[PDB]
Ligand binder design. Structure first.
Ligand SMILES: [K+]
Ligand SMILES: [K+]
Ligand SMILES: [K+]
Ligand SMILES: [K+]
Ligand SMILES: [K+]
Ligand SMILES: [K+]
Ligand SMILES: [K+]
Ligand SMILES: [K+]
Ligand SMILES: [K+]
Ligand SMILES: [K+]
Ligand SMILES: [K+]
Ligand SMILES: [K+]
Ligand SMILES: [K+]
Ligand SMILES: [K+]
Ligand SMILES: [K+]
Ligand SMILES: [K+]
Ligand SMILES: [K+]
Ligand SMILES: [K+]
Ligand SMILES: [K+]
Ligand SMILES: [K+]
Ligand SMILES: [K+]
Ligand SMILES: [K+]
Ligand SMILES: [K+]
Ligand SMILES: [K+]
Ligand SMILES: [K+]
Ligand SMILES: [K+]
Ligand SMILES: [K+]
Ligand SMILES: [K+]
Ligand SMILES: [K+]
Ligand SMILES: [K+]
Ligand SMILES: [K+]
Ligand SMILES: [K+]
Ligand SMILES: [K+]
Ligand SMILES: [K+]
Ligand SMILES: [K+]
Ligand SMILES: [K+]
Ligand SMILES: [K+]
Ligand SMILES: [K+]
Ligand SMILES: [K+]
Ligand SMILES: [K+]
Ligand SMILES: [K+]
Ligand SMILES: [K+]
Ligand SMILES: [K+]
Ligand SMILES: [K+]
Ligand SMILES: [K+]
Ligand SMILES: [K+]
Ligand SMILES: [K+]
Ligand SMILES: [K+]
Ligand SMILES: [K+]
Ligand SMILES: [K+]
Ligand SMILES: [K+]
Ligand SMILES: [K+]
Ligand SMILES: [K+]
Ligand SMILES: [K+]
Ligand SMILES: [K+]
Ligand SMILES: [K+]
Ligand SMILES: [Mg+2]
Ligand SMILES: [Mg+2]
Ligand SMILES: [Mg+2]
Ligand SMILES: [Mg+2]
Ligand SMILES: [Mg+2]
Ligand SMILES: [Mg+2]
Ligand SMILES: [Mg+2]
Ligand SMILES: [Mg+2]
Ligand SMILES: [Mg+2]
Ligand SMILES: [Mg+2]
Ligand SMILES: [Mg+2]
Ligand SMILES: [Mg+2]
Ligand SMILES: [Mg+2]
Ligand SMILES: [Mg+2]
Ligand SMILES: [Mg+2]
Ligand SMILES: [Mg+2]
Ligand SMILES: [Mg+2]
Ligand SMILES: [Mg+2]
Ligand SMILES: [Mg+2]
Ligand SMILES: [Mg+2]
Ligand SMILES: [Mg+2]
Ligand SMILES: [Mg+2]
Ligand SMILES: [Mg+2]
Ligand SMILES: [Mg+2]
Ligand SMILES: [Mg+2]
Ligand SMILES: [Mg+2]
Ligand SMILES: [Mg+2]
Ligand SMILES: [Mg+2]
Ligand SMILES: [Mg+2]
Ligand SMILES: [Mg+2]
Ligand SMILES: [Mg+2]
Ligand SMILES: [Mg+2]
Ligand SMILES: [Mg+2]
Ligand SMILES: [Mg+2]
Ligand SMILES: [Mg+2]
Ligand SMILES: [Mg+2]
Ligand SMILES: [Mg+2]
Lengths: 97, 50, 87
RNA sequence: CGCCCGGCCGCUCAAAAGACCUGAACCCGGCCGGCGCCGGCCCGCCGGCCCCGUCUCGAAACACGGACCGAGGAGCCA
RNA sequence: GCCCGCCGCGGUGCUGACGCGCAGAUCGCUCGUCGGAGCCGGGCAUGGGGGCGAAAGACUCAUCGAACCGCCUGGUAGCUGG
RNA sequence: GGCCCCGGGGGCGAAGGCGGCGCGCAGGCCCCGCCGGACCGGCCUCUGGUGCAGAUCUCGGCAGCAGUAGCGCUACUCCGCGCCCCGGAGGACUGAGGGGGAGACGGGUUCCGCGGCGCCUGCAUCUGGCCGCGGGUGACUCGGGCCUAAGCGGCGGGUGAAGACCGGGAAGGGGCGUGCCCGCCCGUCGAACGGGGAGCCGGCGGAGACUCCGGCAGGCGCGGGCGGAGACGCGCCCCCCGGCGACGCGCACGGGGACCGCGGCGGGCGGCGCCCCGGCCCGCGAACGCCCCGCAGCCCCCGGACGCCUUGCGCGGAGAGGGGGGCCCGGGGGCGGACCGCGCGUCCCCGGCCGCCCCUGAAAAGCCGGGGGGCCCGCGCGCCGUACCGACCGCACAGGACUCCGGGGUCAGCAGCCUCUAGCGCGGGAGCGAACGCGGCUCAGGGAAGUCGGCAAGCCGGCUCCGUAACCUCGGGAAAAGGAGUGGCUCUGACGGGGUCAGAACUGGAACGGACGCGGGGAUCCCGACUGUUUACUAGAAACACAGCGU
RNA sequence: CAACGAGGAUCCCACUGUCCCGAGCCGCGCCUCCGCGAGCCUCCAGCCUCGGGAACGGGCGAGGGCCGGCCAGCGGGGCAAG
RNA sequence: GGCGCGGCGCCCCUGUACGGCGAGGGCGCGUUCGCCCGGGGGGCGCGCCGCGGGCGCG
């Protein structure tokens, strides 16, 4: 009824954090009897224990805004915070030319 | 410290080993009523200067 | 900030264990004991503290050799052994 | 030993003396009675009564020390 | 030994909070400085009428117009208490 | 010290305790009842640490106050018998200078597994750094041992009443093999960040790993005279001359690695009222050995000059350019060990230059070269540290406490604000919605009349363009003062695949740095030239310092 | 004396709850409840007016008031505490 | 004082919902526009009705 040991041993076998290890709540009596990495490997086999994929951050809005920005959008004077020099240094332009 | 001389390790090792209760058969053998060993110490409130 | 905050800057050992007297009194930077005086050849003893004198002196330890010599003199055979030799 | 689910009852003992001899005061809980000192009367009326110790011409003082209780506590010796 | 500004280093005003504290000096906002006489860690040196001081009689382990510890010492009091 | 008439009172109940009569002017004494369970006295003579209400008395116990005052870090909820513990589902936070992952110092067993709630865990507990019982840290290659820094010891002796303190002027030791030869005189003290011979990948455990096991290597030891025109290429010992070890700061520019993105293609997911080849996850290759390739930079050969070349410079008759070569280069490739392209940046190291100083940026062990002279196969590698922690110091605690690694969006950005990975306490909860406080918000009309005093609060603020006075040590003043524009969408032009810069139409309460971040300004007088320093804990200044000047 | 200053002063523009003159709202404390649970202080006590008095009384002389027990608030007195 | 809970109507506040269909500077894409539409959402005020609303203590 205290499963701190199995949670720590499972994240070691699966190489993830303890925050993305999930037990099937049925079969909890099975998990309680496991004390070694070998008995934990059996449960990962019979699918009693699993790991979640990491959640990302969707880049669909980022990729659309960048697509619009190569068309000339979102880039007028109301959108600029740094000076012209900080945005495109005058020395970088001189050297290229 | 994780980097200690063998001489400090040995004196620390002895304070750990002698930090014990009176055995219960000793309490029956020597007919004692004081049962606490008052030379014990605990790491949170001690100042072993060793 | 000369009080509680200043005490949080302490992570040093001024004194360590003495090889002669065993106490937490050996100055690690001056290499001298503030209790027994080591590495001096004589022991540090002061008459302005007789309480410090009684804490570590003859008798506060085992007296292992001196005990045996006295009992041999008082009631054993040692006073006879001198007469054979001193003749 | 027994009975209920720690308690009760009771066992050892001259005695619980039961985590311990005796077990005072200050302070407190339960039952029962009643609504400060001195004096007269059997008894709640009438009469009298400022907080002690101290320094001081002078203290109830808006002068200082003192919540309460116990034990210790200061002219001896050469 | 330039200017705005982050961490860092400091400590202006609110005479704000707290003031039987979170704390025997702290917290919030505001503020000085930020390539330099800049800031930080370890080792080492200087010892009490002495040290050290961009100098405030400042600092020298919560102690400084003379540190701390034991002894001389039950120091002396024409003065307060009993 | 004595007496207490057959040798004083006592378990047939001593001393003490609690109540109650009596006697004495009083200090006090005597008796009775109950408690208690072993010792105690009246009279004469002797002796003293011999009598308490007080001293901010000392030590111990303890009342009212009073069930009172009180219990920073955004946050938990439902179900599982359910506790703040554990599981599942949801909702949030820390926000890569982390409430993340690890070391140094300090602590010392706090580490791990099983059990448990007496103490502690200021509420609870079935939780736990608490309590009981078992366990736990493996090295030729990592550090310590070695070297020396600033220092500190030692030194025939010297000095002082000594303790002790001070010190080169001393017949100062080695190689061997006898016997010759050579020789001026300390430290196996002082760094777990400096110097230093050599380690990488995969796997296994409840708690250890660059240490174990398997594999692949590396280091230090021990035993069985040629080629070239040239730059250059391919055993030892002593004396002397050298080298490596071995070194500051800086804006920039260049190269590599790692990270990070976009697109393809291969495998797997999610949700799906409409749309979706538009969302998410995974596609991995070390040390070491051999071959090739390496910009700058320095060198060789021919030959004899109005050029070569950098972002900047810089270079050449003391021999440029051009043609052909050599050496260095912490790197890359191919084969071993054993999925495919293209980009802007960020961090780290390296390169060649240039700038700066009345500042010029350690030493030694160890290892090597030169000149001169004399002459493949086996075995092994000892000693010590190694668990864990901000569990450390502040009497236990919003204080104090060195370093390393550092993703995405917005953006000038290591700022603010939101977030993937990882991690999840913070002396406890519920109800009500008074005064009053503490931290916040808004206010008609007026606008400092308030107050010692504009204290506090508010106005200003990003970026682009326009426009900027007095005075001045000519450098400044200066963001002086003041103005205007700024979103979304559809497009166009410029630069050699990449962002930026410029312009236009259309459109929306008459809006646009829409949150966040972010100067109010001006005219003067006094003091000190300026940056800097200070009363740790009531004084930051006009005080100290300073360059300059003078004695 | 240009430049510089968390240095001492006077004035103006702009700005505002500083003020005329205050009003409404948010969170957290307070408040009520379950659990937990202290400090300071205390001669004895705790209603006034006048007189006398160590010349400003809770108590003393004379008058006027007053069942007893408690809460949320508050700062006149207790010559309140330190 | 047999509560209230939850509805439907009225009346108010904001300012015309999502969607469907048909104008839009431009190059099937497109901010925005018009119409259904003083609409949709909301209510702590007013009016009338599905589940319900008279214990135990002195
Ligand atoms: K483009
Ligand atoms: K260790
Ligand atoms: K400790
Ligand atoms: K402090
Ligand atoms: K010493
Ligand atoms: K007095
Ligand atoms: K006096
Ligand atoms: K007098
Ligand atoms: K008196
Ligand atoms: K008086
Ligand atoms: K009084
Ligand atoms: K007096
Ligand atoms: K007084
Ligand atoms: K008094
Ligand atoms: K700062
Ligand atoms: K305030
Ligand atoms: K502070
Ligand atoms: K600056
Ligand atoms: K010193
Ligand atoms: K001194
Ligand atoms: K002294
Ligand atoms: K003393
Ligand atoms: K002395
Ligand atoms: K005197
Ligand atoms: K005196
Ligand atoms: K006194
Ligand atoms: K109280
Ligand atoms: K347990
Ligand atoms: K002498
Ligand atoms: K000397
Ligand atoms: K050293
Ligand atoms: K070091
Ligand atoms: K070292
Ligand atoms: K070096
Ligand atoms: K040579
Ligand atoms: K280890
Ligand atoms: K309330
Ligand atoms: K009030
Ligand atoms: K004014
Ligand atoms: K202000
Ligand atoms: K625009
Ligand atoms: K000054
Ligand atoms: K400066
Ligand atoms: K001050
Ligand atoms: K100051
Ligand atoms: K200042
Ligand atoms: K000063
Ligand atoms: K000037
Ligand atoms: K200044
Ligand atoms: K200054
Ligand atoms: K100033
Ligand atoms: K109000
Ligand atoms: K009077
Ligand atoms: K009076
Ligand atoms: K009085
Ligand atoms: K008064
Ligand atoms: Mg330029
Ligand atoms: Mg101090
Ligand atoms: Mg030191
Ligand atoms: Mg008893
Ligand atoms: Mg007097
Ligand atoms: Mg006095
Ligand atoms: Mg008093
Ligand atoms: Mg007494
Ligand atoms: Mg500066
Ligand atoms: Mg600045
Ligand atoms: Mg204040
Ligand atoms: Mg004295
Ligand atoms: Mg004295
Ligand atoms: Mg006596
Ligand atoms: Mg006495
Ligand atoms: Mg007394
Ligand atoms: Mg957040
Ligand atoms: Mg544990
Ligand atoms: Mg508790
Ligand atoms: Mg090594
Ligand atoms: Mg050494
Ligand atoms: Mg090193
Ligand atoms: Mg580990
Ligand atoms: Mg160096
Ligand atoms: Mg470790
Ligand atoms: Mg107004
Ligand atoms: Mg005025
Ligand atoms: Mg006025
Ligand atoms: Mg100045
Ligand atoms: Mg300054
Ligand atoms: Mg101060
Ligand atoms: Mg100050
Ligand atoms: Mg008003
Ligand atoms: Mg009074
Ligand atoms: Mg009276
Ligand atoms: Mg008052
Ligand atoms: Mg419409």
């Amino acid at each position: 009824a205290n499963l701190r040991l199995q949670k720590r041993l499972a994240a070691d076998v699966l190489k993830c954090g303890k925050r993305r290890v999930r037990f099937n709540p049925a079969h909890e009596k099975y998990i309680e009897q496991a004390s070694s990495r070998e008995a934990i490997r059996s449960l990962i086999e019979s699918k009693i224990i699993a790991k979640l994929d990491i959640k990302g951050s969707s880049r669909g809005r980022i990729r659309a805004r960048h697509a619009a920005k190569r068309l000339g959008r979102h880039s007028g004077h109301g959108k600029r915070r740094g000076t012209r020099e900080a945005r495109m240094p005058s020395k970088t332009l001189w050297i290229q030319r | 410290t994780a980097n200690k001389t063998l001489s400090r390790k040995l004196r620390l090792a002895k304070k750990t080993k002698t930090n014990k209760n009176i055995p219960r058969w000793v309490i029956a053998k020597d007919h004692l009523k004081k049962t606490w060993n008052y030379k014990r110490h605990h790491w949170r409130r001690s100042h072993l200067k060793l | 900030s000369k009080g509680t905050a200043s005490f949080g800057k302490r992570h040093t050992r001024i004194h360590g264990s003495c090889r002669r007297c065993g106490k937490h009194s050996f100055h690690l930077q001056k290499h001298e004991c503030a209790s027994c005086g080591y590495p001096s050849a004589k022991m540090r003893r002061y008459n302005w503290s007789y309480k410090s004198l009684r804490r570590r002196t003859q008798g506060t330890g085992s007296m292992s050799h001196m005990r045996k010599v006295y009992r041999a003199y008082n009631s054993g055979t040692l006073k006879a052994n001198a007469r054979k030799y001193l003749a």
